[PDB]
Design a protein around this ligand. Structure first.
Ligand SMILES: Nc1ncnc2c1ncn2[C@@H]1O[C@H](COP(=O)(O)OP(=O)(O)O)[C@@H](O)[C@H]1O
Ligand SMILES: [Mg+2]
Length: 772
């Protein structure tokens, strides 16, 4: 009291703001709905003036806090206020399961949605994206803000509409795919997305760590060409057994030698086969080579009804649907003289990781992120902020139990479930593979135990099931990816029984996953036990140290009859687990480097491309591309060092820029390249001014606008593909000791040069020649 007011801080940034917001809690306590709502208009004014989101934060969150209470009945605990603050800072709020992560997000979503730039709230699947949007939207609309739901089944129009709302719920995939499409548009107005302001990712460690490199692809409705496969195969019939190519015994590895390499360079009329401009050609020869030397007909595959069918080596049984990849199937189709069925071509591509970084602001939530903090900082520049639970966790996380054989471990799981089932306490068996869920289910049916099995198939159907897993008698086998996001509240008479008993069947590659399973119990403060069963036979127990240890236990005489539960053991296991998590981080880190090569290239091209679409006049640009294109032509024929500059370039110009027979005797001969370039450029300019004004002015700007886009997109496609072929075969271009990364960066840079020149020569011919 008085002794207190006189004393009045060792509180952190979040404990504070949470208290401030709690203080001004009555200044909205009795306000009126219309008045509470008008608060938005107010915040918007102040922001218009000069205030910042940080400024209004304390009040904004107070508004939402009251708003919720009225609209939902829930008054945002103080822990939750701290979470919102963390999110607003562009960081990761780590709130254990059950803490109210969803509601927690409405705080910073609202705040960052006032400037009118839109805010994306991302989820794992449309069910959750639709539920949240549906439930939380009721709060935002209350404070006069429009919530939009962006789904896969929506039309370019209806999408654009939701991407226009203040807030927009969606899923990682849709957001990604829309982005690729907005980047294939012909008219700036065909896009759906607004600049990527700020995204708030739920289940963020799953989206940015686990599914980070998930590829989002837009393939081509049309097909690829087949001419090269033929040429490549025809060529391979030329070569000989040893001085033309090598063939490894153990591995089916096949390589070309200097002779074949020269015979190839000779055969296809090219200086360098390793030249980045011929990556596709070199790749085709390696498959056509593989198809003739490492794939035997009637043993590796068969030819039936004009096709190539993969024979399962030992079972002699055909695998009717599948093909070989990286064009090896087309290589064999060519060899066997069959109809070459070509693959479709990728037109646009991007990973979740490289898509989310296009944003201006990012924030995420998950109950499990601390372990990956470092990665989050370096890649997404986000920090993990651990928000304290609303109530103290009283859940009894018993130490791992180890059996000798899987059968033993699984029998134990059933025994346990049974015992708990008899008392009537709920049980939720966590699993990692659906195959495993079924293993236990069969075991529970042999005991007469009624249960449910979730395999992340139908999310809504499963969500409902889960919601009833806290009820007395319930028994649920859920596969790691099932039920995510649905709170299991305890049924009447359940805490009195011990709360939810969680039973883990294996430790996952990442402790995070094990902790997510643990977290389903001990919700707000509810009682509950978690227990993991493992066997010496599990995948992890055969790893690093785990081996040595289990080796010793085996020699010690351990049986299924009696499990092991030692702090020395359980910690030696924990030691491996960390090591596994170590290397997995090292790999990710390495792959980040390769992924970046194409990433930076894509960001550049898209930017340049958007500029084209968002440009009214394009002639200066096209002219430049022609200049460059041309300078290259002349340089091709004017060796800066039997003959001193032969000439044919003439017909190369009359056939590529001017018209047939427009020049030859004109200023070309003995001259200097420096000269020939400007002379021929004028001819071109009048030739363009002519076509320009003479055949259609506005029609020229659009004649251009199209000819360029098609040029970019066309070459990008080729690039994405050659860039892939290069990566796949970069160990072939790198030397023994050398690290391929460098070689990939270098050639990857060299190919981009190639791709710009290719874009240039195309937009050069087409513009100066063809008519609309
Ligand atoms: N401030 C609150 N007051 C009362 N209940 C809340 C509050 N915040 C969240 N909840 C409840 O917590 C449960 C789980 O919420 P959820 O947002 O899904 O959190 P999480 O994602 O961590 O599990 C829901 O039943 C939700 O209604
Ligand atoms: Mg959630």
């Amino acid at each position: 009291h008085m002794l207190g007011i006189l004393n009045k801080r060792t509180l952190n940034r979040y404990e504070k703001i949470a208290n401030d917001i709690d203080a001004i809690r009555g200044d909205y306590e009795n306000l009126s709905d219309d008045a509470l709502k008008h608060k938005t208009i107010e915040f918007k004014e102040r922001l218009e003036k000069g205030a910042t989101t940080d400024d209004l934060l304390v009040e904004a969150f107070a508004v939402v806090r009251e708003a919720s209470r009225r609209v939902t009945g829930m008054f945002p605990f103080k822990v939750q206020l701290m979470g919102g603050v963390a999110l607003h800072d562009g960081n990761i709020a780590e709130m254990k399961t059950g803490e109210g992560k969803t509601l927690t997000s409405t705080l910073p979503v609202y705040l960052n949605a006032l400037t009118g730039k839109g805010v994306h709230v991302v989820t794992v699947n449309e069910y959750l994206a639709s539920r949240d949007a549906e439930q939380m939207g009721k709060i935002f609309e209350f404070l006069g803000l429009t919530v939009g739901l962006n789904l896969n089944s929506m039309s370019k129009d209806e999408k654009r509409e939701a991407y226009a709302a203040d807030i927009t719920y969606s899923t990682n995939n849709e957001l990604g795919f829309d982005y690729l499409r907005d980047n294939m548009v012909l008219y700036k107005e065909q896009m759906v997305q607004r600049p990527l302001h700020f995204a708030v990712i739920d289940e963020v460690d799953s989206i940015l760590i686990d599914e980070a490199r998930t590829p989002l692809i837009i393939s081509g409705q049309a097909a690829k060409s087949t001419k090269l496969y033929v040429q490549a195969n025809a060529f391979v019939r030329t070569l000989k057994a040893e001085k033309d190519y090598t063939y490894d015994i153990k591995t089916k590895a096949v390589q070309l030698t200097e002779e074949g390499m020269t015979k190839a360079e000779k055969a296809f009329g090219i200086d360098n086969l390793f030249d980045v401009k011929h990556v596709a050609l070199n790749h085709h020869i390696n498959q056509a080579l593989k198809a003739h030397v490492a794939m035997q007909k009637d043993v590796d595959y068969v030819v039936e009804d004009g096709q190539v069918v993969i024979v399962d080596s030992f079972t002699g049984r055909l695998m009717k649907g599948r093909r070989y990849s990286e064009g090896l199937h087309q290589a064999i189709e060519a060899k066997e003289g069959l109809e070459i069925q070509n693959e479709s071509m990728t037109l646009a591509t991007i990973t979740f990781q490289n898509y989310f970084r296009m944003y201006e602001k990012l924030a995420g939530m998950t109950g499990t992120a601390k372990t990956e903090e470092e990665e989050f900082r370096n890649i997404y520049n986000m920090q993990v902020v651990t928000i304290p639970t609303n109530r103290p966790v009283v859940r009894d996380d018993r130490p791992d139990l180890i059996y000798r054989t899987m059968e033993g471990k699984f029998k134990a799981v059933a025994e346990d479930v049974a015992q708990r089932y008899m008392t009537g306490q709920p049980v939720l068996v966590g699993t990692v593979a659906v195959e495993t869920s079924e293993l236990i289910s069969k075991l529970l049916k042999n005991k007469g135990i009624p249960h449910q099995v979730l395999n992340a198939k139908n999310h809504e159907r499963e969500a409902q099931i889960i919601e009833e897993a806290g009820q007395k008698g319930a028994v649920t086998i859920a596969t790691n990816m099932a039920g995510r996001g649905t709170d299991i509240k305890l049924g009447e008479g359940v805490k009195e029984l011990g709360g939810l008993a969680v039973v883990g069947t294996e430790r996952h590659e990442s402790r995070r996953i094990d902790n997510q399973l643990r977290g389903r119990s001990g919700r707000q403060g509810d009682p509950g036990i978690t227990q993991f069963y493992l066997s010496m036979e599990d995948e992890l127990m055969r790893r690093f140290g785990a081996e040595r240890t289990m080796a010793m236990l085996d020699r010690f005489g351990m049986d299924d009859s009696t499990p092991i539960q030692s702090k020395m053991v359980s910690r030696a296991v924990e030691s491996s687990q960390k090591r596994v998590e170590g290397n997995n981080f090292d790999s990710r880190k390495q792959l980040l480097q390769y992924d970046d090569v194409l990433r930076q290239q894509r960001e550049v091209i898209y930017k340049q491309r958007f500029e084209v679409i968002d440009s009214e006049n394009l002639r200066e640009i096209v002219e430049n591309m022609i200049k460059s294109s041309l300078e290259r032509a002349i340089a091709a024929y004017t060796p800066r060092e039997e003959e001193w500059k032969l000439d044919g370039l003439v017909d190369l110009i009359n056939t590529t820029y001017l018209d047939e027979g427009a020049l030859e005797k004109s200023d070309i001969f003995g001259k200097e390249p420096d000269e020939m370039l400007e002379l021929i450029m004028d001819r071109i300019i009048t030739k363009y001014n002519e076509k320009e004004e003479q055949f259609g002015k506005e029609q020229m700007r659009e004649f251009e606008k199209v000819i360029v886009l098609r040029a970019v997109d066309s070459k990008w496609m080729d690039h994405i593909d050659a860039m892939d072929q290069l990566r796949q075969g970069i160990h072939l271009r790198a030397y023994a000791q050398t690290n391929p990364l460098r070689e990939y960066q270098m050639e990857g840079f060299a190919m981009f040069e190639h791709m710009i020149e290719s874009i240039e020569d195309e937009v050069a011919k087409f513009v100066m020649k063809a008519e609309i």
